[PDB]
Design a binder for this molecule. Structure first.
Ligand SMILES: CC(C)CCCCCO
Ligand SMILES: CC(C)CCCCCO
Lengths: 121, 121
């Protein structure tokens, strides 16, 4: 669930999921339209494409457990859903960290009319 | 479109396009700088050069139709675009399987950061 996803985000990046990654670019948030604008925006694009392969589960709320092993995120075992949802989240949070370098405030509260292509997954 | 591409990849490699390939090496996923890490990575590179030679088309989005005859991918006839795109995708997918034996988890979620400079495709 987003309660776990938000925890990984704050752990890996130090920024809170809400402002920092809830209104960033064309895909970090809920609107989802156009072409990713940067490294961080693509992490977000890939992430909900990941939630896309999980029709039989509900990512927003089923909670899973994870823990670190030698500092790395590891998804504890559980139901197939809990595990796949967690992998989607794990990767995304790591992706936000590897790109903390190009994270710019110019992409926050980005306007809808600047989100461009037709892109599906 | 990514829809045809992504599942072309699972038909050939057995892996789901997203985790396995969305962020592999320096050119898998989107991304575009650096000297390709390995064979798999070289395919993403070549695939990018391929999309790059279709200025008149929208590669990431146009849906094309393809069939498998006697286990081989065959691009059905459509527009000039749908056909050239399909071939780009088929070439990448097939390459992916040819190099499955060198696929290294060591490169999934690779720091785009470590990749510097633009190779002449
Ligand atoms: C859910 C908010 C807090 C951050 C979302 C990143 C979503 C990528 O689809
Ligand atoms: C995101 C998956 C479908 C693979 C993308 C490969 C792009 C190569 O330029």
């Amino acid at each position: 669930s987003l309660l776990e996803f938000g925890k990984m985000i704050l752990e890996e990046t130090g920024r809170l999921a809400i402002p920092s990654y809830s209104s960033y670019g064309c895909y970090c948030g809920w609107g989802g339209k156009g072409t990713p604008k940067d490294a961080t925006d693509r992490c977000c694009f890939v992430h909900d494409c990941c939630y896309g392969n999980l029709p039989d589960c509900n990512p927003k709320s089923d909670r899973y457990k994870y823990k670190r092993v030698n500092g790395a995120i590891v998804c504890e075992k559980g139901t197939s859903c809990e595990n796949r949802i967690c992998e989607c989240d794990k990767a995304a949070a790591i992706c936000f960290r590897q790109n903390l370098n190009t994270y710019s405030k110019k992409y926050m509260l980005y306007p809808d009319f600047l989100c461009k292509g037709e892109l599906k997954c």
